[PDB]
Design a protein around this ligand. Structure first.
Ligand SMILES: Nc1ncnc2c1ncn2[C@@H]1O[C@H](COP(=O)(O)OP(=O)(O)OP(=O)(O)O)[C@@H](O)[C@H]1O
Ligand code: SF4
Ligand code: SF4
Lengths: 55, 138, 386, 136, 608
C-alpha cells in the first residue's frame, strides 16, 4: 500500500498563525532574556519553571 | 410572415421530431423550432409509437412538427381500455368487437379522400382495416 | 471471495451473520458495498501497548475487537480498506475480552484473516455481489484447462477476479502400453461434458469468453477436435457458432502452474484473441470503423455515449478498466445503469483493460463508447456539445 | 547481397564456404566472424554455400566482446584471399579473409574499417564506402 | 525506463474560425472533460490556446478540427534543450543559432521557414531573443547565459556593448523595391555614400558585379537580379567587422551568383567575419569554410546544428538524414535519372515537331540573335545562360507575345506559357483562377502530391493573390501552365523563390507529364540539377549581358553541358559517395587532366 501517503498532514485542519509583537533581535533579545530569567524573577512554586500553562 | 406550408412526413416513434429532426432543420428555408422541441417533446410523449404524420409548418422563423393525423390511429380508437403492457407481452392482441355505425360515425370524418359511393365504398372500407377490432362489429 | 458462513437467525428474519475472507482488491470493493454504518465486525489485530508508568510494561496477546462501524477509509488503487469504529463493549465478557472499553479502534483489512459482519441491512443486491462475485466493473473473462498425460485441471476465471470458480478434472489419458488403452477416449469424452455442464451453470456462458486448452503433448489439439466432434453430434450451436472461445496452447507444466506458463510466456498468447481481449478488440475496431467515416453509427466519451443512448441508437457498449480503477468509486454505478439502459434499447458489452493499447485509445475517449445498430444523426445536440 | 545492396554484382570466385572464419575488420569489439550462411546463394546437394567479396553472410562471433558472442548476425565480406578476376582482366587477392558486422539493411555496426577494402564491396554497400580508407 | 517525450502544439490562426466549429477544441478534449487546463479559451483575440503542459498528446483535437488548424507532435525532448526564442503562444519557435567566426565564412542552409532569417536578426542586434520566455526589455544579459556552452556566448557580449555593429543585407527580395527609391535617388548614389573603403572600391566592386549598366537606373526600376547585386555592393563598401548576407543568390543568374560568391569571400581575406545563408549548394560550397544545417518542419520549428566542415555539411545534407538529431528531415531522397533510366522510344511523333528559322529581336539597345534549330516531339529542351542574354526574349517570341524584328515563327501549335517574374495582376481568388484554367487537373492524384497537400492551398483558396506569398505563388503558376492541354509548353525560370524540396517537386512534375503525354517542353533555368533531370537537349546562350546575345540549336545533354561549363571554367568532377558535382579549383593537375578530356560533370555513365 502506498495509500495513506500524507493522510494526516492533509487531514489536519488549517489554522493560520497569529499576528504578534515583533521580538527584538540580538543583544536586545539577550537583554529580555536576562531580565525575564534573572531580574524581576517570576514564580518559584516549589522551585522554578520556564513556561507551564495552567498550574 | 417569413413563412410557407407543411411537409407531412414523420418517420418514427422517437420524439424531439423523429429524434434530432428538431435541429437540422432551417437548411434551405427560414425557421427554427416553435414546437420543434417543445410540442414535439409533446409529439410522441403525446401519442407514443406507431407513427402518425408530423406536419412541420414553417410559420415564422420557427418550424412546427405538426403531429396531426387520422385513422389506423382513430380506428383502434375503437376501444375503451388498454392498460399498457410495458414491453413483449406476447403481442397483446387487442381484437374484440365494437359499436354499430362503423361509418358516418367513424368514417364520415375520414370521408372525402376515399372516392366513389360513400358508404358502399368508404363506410365499407374502414371495416377491413379493423384487423385490430379482430372479431368484427357485432 | 470465500464465504465461510452466512446464517439467518431465528430472532431476525432480516439481516445476517457473514464470516468471509476477501482475497483481492476486487473483493475489498465487495466488502465495501456490503458493510453499512452501525453494522458490527469482530476481527483480530494485536493490541496491548500500554503506558510506562507502573511496570515495563505491556504484555502482548492477539486481542479481538467487536467494533461497531462509524466510518471507512477506502482506497482501491492502494488496496486499502479501513473501518473506524467504537468498541461495542461486550459487558457480557463472551466477546471483546482483553480490550479496554472506551477507546476507538480500527480495522485495516487484510486478505489473511477472515472477519465477521453482523449485518442489519442485508439486501438482495448485496447477496448477488456475495455469491456471484461483485465486479459491476468486470476486469477478466477467462477459463483454462491444463492437461498433462495423467492429470488435468479445469481452471477458470471469474465473474469478478483472477479467482478460480471451479477446479474441474477428469480421468486423463496416460500413454498406456497398448495403442493408448480405450479408457483414454471415453474418459476424455466425459470431461467435455463435465466442463460444458459446469461453465453453463456457473457462468451465464455469455460472460466468459475464454477457454485456453493447454498441454504438454498433442493432447490439447486432440481434445479440441474431440470438443467439436461431440459438438456436431449434439448440434450444439452454443459451441459451433463460436470458434472464438477456445484457444489451443502448449506448456511444459500443467498443474495450476500451467496457466501462467502459457499466458506470460510469448508462446501462445500476446494481444491475439486470449479471449479476454476478444470481442473487446473486435467491437473497439467497428467503433472506429464507423466513427472515422463520420457516419453517426459510432459515438464516444462519458458525455456523448450517455446522449447516443438517449437516442437509443447503440449496440456494442465499450467500457474500460481505467476510468473505473484510476481513482473513483461512485461513478461506476452510473455507467452500470447506462449499460442496462442501453441494452434495454439494444446491445451486448465489452470491458477493455486500459493497461493496453486498445484500452488507452478508448481512455483518450473517456473510457466509454459505443457502436450503434443504426444511424441516429446529431446525438450531440439536445445535450449541447460536439 | 539483397536488401540495401544498391547495385548488382558481377560474379566473383567464391572464397569462403560455411564454417570459414574471417577477421573482423571493424571497431565493433568483434575479433572474428564465423560464416554460417551466404545470402542469396542457391541449392545443390552437397554444395557448401560459400561467400565472396561484398557478399552478405550470416555469422556468429567466435572471439570478441561477450555482448556480441553467442548470437547470429549479418556481416559483409570486405577482403578475400581466394584470388578472383575482374573484367579488366586482373587476378587479384588480399592477404586475409575479412568482413564487418552489419544490419539487414546494410548498415555497419562499427564506425571504422581497419585495413583495405575491395572496390566491389565498396561499390555495393554505401555505408561501407563511408567507413573505408584505402579502397582496392 | 521509457525515453522522455514532450508535446508541442502550434496552431495557425489563419486556418481557424471558432464560429463555424464552435470552440470545439475545448469541448472535444479529454483533459478539459476532466476539468483540466489543456485548452484554454482566450476571450480577446478569440483564439484557442493549447498549453503544452496539460495536453495528453491524444491528437483527438487535431482530427476533430474541421479545417486542420491544430498540429500536435510528439518529440523526444529534442527541442526543449535548445530553446532560443519564440514568437508567441502556439507559434514558430527558434532553436540554436549559427556560429560566427572571424576571417572566415560560415554557411547556413535549410528549407524555408526554419528561422534562418530570424537568426540573422538576433545576431544583428535588431531583435532580442525572448528565450522562449518573457525576456523583452533589453535583456541581452540573459541571452549570454542561455548561450553558455556555445561559442555564441562571446559574440553576445560583444553585441550588447555595441563594439561591433553588423551590416545586414536584407533577406526579403520582394519587399526591397517598396522600401527604397533611388537608394533615395539611383543606385549610383547609394554606392558613393556607402563607400567607406577605397575609391578603387567603387570602381572595382562595380566591375566585378557587372553593375556598370545599372548605375543610372533607380532601385524601383531594377530587375530582380540587379536589385540583389546593389545590396551586395553596399555590404563590401561598408566599414565594419561583420558582414551578414542573407540569401545572396536569389534572383541571380548562374554566372552572376558565382561572381557574388567570390567577392563576398574576399572579406575573409581582410580577416573580417562573414556569415551567409544560401539555397544554392554550388554557391554555398564556394563561399564557406564552415557550414550549418537548419532542419525541422517549416513554420513549426527549426534547429541549427553544430558547426561542420564545408565538404562534410554538404554530404550530410543530401542524405536527408542527420544522425545525432536522428531525424529524417526529408521524406524522400533526391536522385537524378542516369539517362540509362529513361524510357527508350523512337521519337519523332509526326516526323519531328516544328522548326524555327534564324530569328532576331532588337530593342535598339540590346540585340538578340538566334541560330536556326529544330524541335522534336515529346522532347524537353533546357535553356541556360546569364540573364540579359535574351533567354526571356526568345521564349516570348515562340509564345507569339513578341514579334521578331526579323525571322518569323508562325506555328499552328497551341501554346501554354508561364512567365518568369510573377507579380499578381489578376483580380480573383486563387481557387477561382486555377479552376478556370482547368478543373480535373485538380482532381488528379499527381497534383495532390505536388501542389495541394504540401502547401495547403485549401486555406489559400479564399486568399487573394495580392495577399499571397512568393514561393507559394510560384508552384501554383507552374502547375497552371500544365493545367491546359497544349502541343508545346513553355516555362521560364521555375526555380525562383523556391527552396530545395520545392524545386525538386517541380523537376519531377515537368519530366513525368511530358513523358506521359508525349508533348514537348522548353524550360529556362539557372539551377544545374533541375536542367539535368528534365532535359534531353539544351540550348546555351552566350555573348555579353545587357549588350548582345546569341542562341544555339539544341544539342545533346553531354554536348551542351560541356559548352556551358567551359564558359564558367569550373568542373564539377564527381564525388564518389554523393554522386554530387564536386567543384574543381583553377590551375590544377587533376582539373587540368579533365580539360583535356572534356568532362565538366560526371554521372553514372562511362567515362574517365
Ligand atoms: N512575427 C512572427 N510571429 C510569429 N512567428 C513568426 C514571426 N516571424 C517569423 N515567425 C516564424 O519564424 C519562422 C520563420 O522565419 P525565418 O524568418 O526565421 O525563416 P528562414 O528560416 O529564414 O526561412 P525562409 O527560408 O522561409 O525565409 C517561420 O516558420 C514563422 O513561423
Ligand atoms: S480551429 Fe477548427 S474546429 Fe477549432 S474553432 Fe477553428 S475552425 Fe472550429
Ligand atoms: S491533443 Fe488531446 S489532450 Fe492535447 S489538447 Fe488536443 S485533445 Fe486535449
Amino acid at each position: 500500500s502506498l495509500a495513506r501517503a500524507g493522510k494526516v498532514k492533509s487531514q489536519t485542519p488549517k489554522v493560520e498563525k497569529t499576528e504578534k509583537p515583533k521580538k527584538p533581535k540580538g543583544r536586545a533579545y539577550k537583554r529580555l532574556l536576562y531580565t525575564r530569567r534573572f531580574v524581576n524573577v517570576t514564580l518559584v512554586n516549589g522551585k522554578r519553571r520556564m513556561n507551564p500553562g495552567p498550574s | 410572415p417569413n413563412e410557407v406550408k407543411y411537409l407531412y412526413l414523420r418517420a418514427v416513434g422517437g420524439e424531439v421530431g423523429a429524434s434530432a429532426a428538431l435541429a437540422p432543420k432551417i437548411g434551405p428555408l427560414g425557421l427554427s423550432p416553435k414546437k420543434v422541441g417543445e410540442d414535439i417533446a409533446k409529439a410522441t410523449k403525446e401519442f407514443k409509437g406507431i407513427k402518425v404524420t408530423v406536419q412541420l409548418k414553417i410559420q415564422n422563423r420557427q418550424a412546427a412538427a405538426s403531429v396531426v393525423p387520422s385513422a389506423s390511429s382513430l380506428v383502434i380508437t375503437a376501444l375503451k381500455e388498454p392498460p399498457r403492457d410495458r414491453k413483449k407481452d406476447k403481442n397483446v392482441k387487442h381484437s374484440g368487437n365494437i359499436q354499430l355505425d362503423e361509418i358516418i360515425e367513424i368514417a364520415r370524418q375520414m370521408r372525402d379522400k376515399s372516392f366513389g359511393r360513400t358508404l358502399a365504398s368508404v363506410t365499407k372500407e374502414i371495416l377491413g382495416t379493423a384487423q385490430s377490432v379482430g372479431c368484427r362489429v357485432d | 471471495m470465500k464465504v465461510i458462513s452466512l446464517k439467518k437467525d431465528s430472532f431476525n428474519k432480516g439481516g445476517a451473520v457473514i464470516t468471509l475472507l476477501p482475497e483481492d482488491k476486487e473483493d475489498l470493493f465487495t466488502v465495501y458495498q456490503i458493510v453499512d454504518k452501525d453494522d458490527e465486525l469482530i476481527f483480530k489485530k494485536k493490541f496491548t501497548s500500554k503506558l510506562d508508568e507502573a511496570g515495563k510494561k505491556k504484555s502482548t496477546d492477539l486481542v479481538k475487537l467487536k467494533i461497531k462501524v462509524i466510518s471507512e477509509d477506502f482506497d482501491m488503487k492502494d488496496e486499502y480498506l479501513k473501518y473506524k469504529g467504537v468498541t461495542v463493549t461486550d459487558e457480557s465478557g463472551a466477546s471483546n475480552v482483553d480490550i479496554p472499553v472506551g477507546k476507538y479502534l480500527s480495522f485495516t483489512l487484510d486478505y489473511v484473516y477472515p472477519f465477521t459482519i453482523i449485518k442489519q441491512n442485508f439486501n438482495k443486491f448485496m447477496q448477488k455481489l456475495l455469491n456471484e462475485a461483485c465486479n459491476i466493473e468486470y476486469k477478466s473473462d477467462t477459463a483454462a484447462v491444463v492437461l498433462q498425460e495423467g492429470i488435468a485441471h479445469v481452471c477458470l476465471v471469474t465473474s469478478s477476479s483472477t479467482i478460480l470458480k471451479q477446479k474441474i478434472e477428469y480421468s486423463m489419458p496416460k500413454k498406456k502400453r497398448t495403442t493408448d488403452v480405450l479408457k483414454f477416449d471415453e474418459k476424455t469424452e466425459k470431461f467435455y461434458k463435465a466442463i460444458y455442464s459446469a461453465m453453463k451453470k456457473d457462468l451465464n456462458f455469455d460472460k466468459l469468453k475464454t477457454i485456453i486448452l493447454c498441454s504438454p503433448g498433442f493432447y490439447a489439439k486432440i481434445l479440441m477436435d474431440k470438443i467439436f466432434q461431440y459438438a456436431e453430434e449434439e448440434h450444439n450451436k452454443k459451441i459451433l457458432d463460436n470458434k472464438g472461445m477456445f484457444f489451443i496452447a502448449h506448456c511444459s507444466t500443467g498443474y495450476l502452474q500451467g496457466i501462467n506458463e502459457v499466458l506470460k510466456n510469448p508462446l501462445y498468447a500476446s494481444k491475439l484473441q486470449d479471449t479476454k481481449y476478444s470481442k473487446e478488440i473486435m467491437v473497439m475496431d467497428e467503433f472506429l470503423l464507423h466513427l472515422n467515416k463520420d457516419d453517426d453509427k459510432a459515438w464516444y466519451g462519458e458525455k456523448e455515449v450517455v446522449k447516443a443512448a438517449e437516442y437509443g441508437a447503440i449496440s456494442y457498449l465499450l467500457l474500460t478498466d481505467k476510468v473505473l480503477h484510476s481513482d473513483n468509486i461512485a461513478q461506476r454505478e452510473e455507467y452500470l445503469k447506462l449499460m442496462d439502459s442501453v441494452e434495454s434499447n439494444g446491445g451486448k458489452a465489452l470491458v477493455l483493460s486500459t493497461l493496453h493499447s486498445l484500452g488507452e485509445e478508448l481512455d483518450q475517449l473517456t473510457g466509454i463508447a459505443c457502436i450503434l445498430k443504426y444511424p441516429l444523426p446529431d446525438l450531440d445536440e439536445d445535450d449541447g456539445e460536439e | 547481397s539483397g536488401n540495401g545492396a544498391q547495385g548488382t554484382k558481377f560474379r566473383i570466385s567464391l572464397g569462403l564456404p560455411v564454417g570459414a572464419i574471417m577477421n573482423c575488420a571493424d571497431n565493433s569489439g568483434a575479433r572474428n566472424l564465423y560464416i554460417i550462411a551466404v545470402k542469396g546463394s542457391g541449392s545443390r546437394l552437397n554444395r557448401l554455400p560459400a561467400a565472396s567479396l561484398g557478399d552478405m553472410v550470416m555469422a556468429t562471433v567466435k572471439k570478441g566482446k561477450p555482448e556480441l558472442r553467442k548470437k547470429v548476425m549479418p556481416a559483409i565480406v570486405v577482403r578475400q584471399a581466394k584470388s578472383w578476376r575482374r573484367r579488366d582482366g586482373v587476378f587479384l587477392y588480399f592477404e586475409d579473409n575479412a568482413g564487418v558486422i552489419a544490419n539487414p539493411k546494410g548498415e555497419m555496426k562499427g564506425s571504422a574499417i581497419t585495413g583495405p577494402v575491395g572496390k566491389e564491396c565498396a561499390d555495393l554497400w554505401p555505408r561501407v564506402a563511408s567507413n573505408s580508407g584505402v579502397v582496392v | 525506463m521509457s525515453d522522455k517525450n514532450s508535446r508541442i502544439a502550434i496552431v495557425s490562426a489563419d486556418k481557424c474560425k471558432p464560429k463555424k466549429c464552435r470552440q470545439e477544441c475545448k469541448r472535444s478534449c479529454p483533459v478539459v472533460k476532466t476539468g483540466k487546463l489543456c485548452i484554454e479559451v482566450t476571450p480577446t483575440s478569440k483564439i484557442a490556446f493549447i498549453s503544452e503542459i496539460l495536453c495528453i498528446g491524444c491528437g483527438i483535437c487535431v482530427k476533430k478540427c474541421p479545417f486542420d488548424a491544430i498540429q500536435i507532435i510528439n518529440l523526444p525532448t529534442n527541442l526543449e534543450a535548445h530553446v532560443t526564442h519564440r514568437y508567441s503562444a502556439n507559434s514558430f519557435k527558434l532553436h540554436r543559432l549559427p556560429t560566427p567566426r572571424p576571417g572566415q565564412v560560415l554557411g547556413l542552409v535549410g528549407t524555408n521557414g526554419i528561422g534562418k532569417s530570424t537568426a540573422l536578426k538576433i545576431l544583428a542586434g535588431k531583435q532580442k531573443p525572448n528565450l522562449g520566455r518573457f525576456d523583452d526589455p533589453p535583456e541581452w544579459q540573459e541571452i549570454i547565459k542561455y548561450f553558455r556552452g556555445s561559442e555564441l556566448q562571446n559574440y553576445f557580449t560583444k553585441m550588447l556593448e555595441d563594439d561591433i555593429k553588423a551590416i545586414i543585407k536584407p533577406q526579403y527580395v520582394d519587399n526591397i523595391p517598396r522600401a527604397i527609391k533611388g537608394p533615395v535617388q539611383k543606385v549610383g548614389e547609394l554606392l558613393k555614400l556607402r563607400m567607406e573603403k577605397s575609391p578603387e572600391d567603387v570602381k572595382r566592386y562595380i566591375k566585378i558585379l557587372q553593375l556598370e549598366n545599372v548605375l543610372k537606373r533607380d532601385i524601383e526600376k531594377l530587375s530582380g537580379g540587379e536589385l540583389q547585386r546593389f545590396a551586395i555592393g553596399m555590404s563590401c563598401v561598408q566599414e565594419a567587422d561583420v558582414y551578414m548576407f542573407d540569401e545572396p543568390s536569389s534572383y541571380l543568374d548562374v554566372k552572376q551568383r558565382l561572381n557574388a560568391a567570390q567577392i563576398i569571400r574576399s572579406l575573409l581575406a581582410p580577416t573580417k567575419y562573414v556569415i551567409c545563408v544560401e539555397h544554392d549548394l554550388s554557391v554555398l560550397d564556394y563561399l564557406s569554410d564552415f557550414v550549418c544545417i537548419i532542419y525541422g518542419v517549416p513554420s513549426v520549428y527549426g534547429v541549427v546544428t553544430l558547426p561542420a566542415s564545408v565538404r562534410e555539411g554538404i554530404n550530410i545534407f543530401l542524405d536527408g538524414h542527420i544522425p545525432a538529431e536522428n531525424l529524417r528531415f526529408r521524406t524522400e531522397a533526391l536522385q537524378f535519372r542516369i539517362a540509362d533510366a529513361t524510357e527508350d522510344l523512337q521519337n519523332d511523333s509526326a516526323s519531328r515537331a516544328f522548326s524555327y528559322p534564324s530569328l532576331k529581336k532588337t530593342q535598339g539597345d540590346f540585340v538578340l540573335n538566334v541560330e536556326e534549330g529544330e524541335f522534336s516531339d515529346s522532347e524537353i529542351l533546357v535553356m541556360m545562360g546569364e540573364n540579359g542574354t535574351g533567354k526571356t526574349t526568345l521564349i516570348k517570341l515562340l509564345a507569339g507575345a513578341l514579334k521578331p524584328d526579323e525571322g518569323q515563327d508562325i506555328p499552328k501549335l497551341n501554346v501554354s506559357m508561364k512567365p518568369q517574374k510573377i507579380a499578381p495582376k489578376f483580380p480573383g481568388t486563387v481557387r477561382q483562377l486555377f479552376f478556370k484554367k482547368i478543373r480535373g487537373q485538380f482532381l488528379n492524384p499527381q497534383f495532390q502530391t505536388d501542389v495541394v497537400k504540401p502547401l495547403r492551398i485549401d486555406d489559400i483558396i479564399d486568399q487573394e493573390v495580392q495577399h499571397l506569398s512568393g514561393g507559394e505563388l510560384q508552384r501554383v503558376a507552374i502547375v497552371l501552365a500544365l493545367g491546359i492541354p497544349a502541343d508545346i509548353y513553355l516555362i521560364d525560370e521555375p526555380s525562383a523563390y523556391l527552396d530545395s524540396e520545392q524545386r525538386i517537386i517541380c523537376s519531377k512534375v515537368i519530366r513525368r507529364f511530358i513523358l506521359h503525354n508525349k508533348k514537348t517542353a522548353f524550360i529556362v533555368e539557372h539551377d544545374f540539377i533541375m536542367a539535368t533531370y528534365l532535359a534531353d537537349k539544351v540550348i546555351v546562350f552566350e555573348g555579353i549581358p545587357s549588350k548582345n546575345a546569341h542562341a544555339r540549336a539544341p544539342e545533346s545533354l553531354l554536348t551542351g553541358c560541356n559548352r556551358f561549363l567551359k564558359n564558367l571554367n569550373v568542373t564539377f568532377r564527381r564525388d564518389p559517395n554523393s554522386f554530387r558535382p564536386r567543384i574543381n579549383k583553377l590551375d590544377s593537375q587533376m582539373d587540368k587532366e579533365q580539360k583535356s578530356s572534356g568532362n565538366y560533370f560526371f554521372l553514372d555513365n562511362t567515362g574517365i
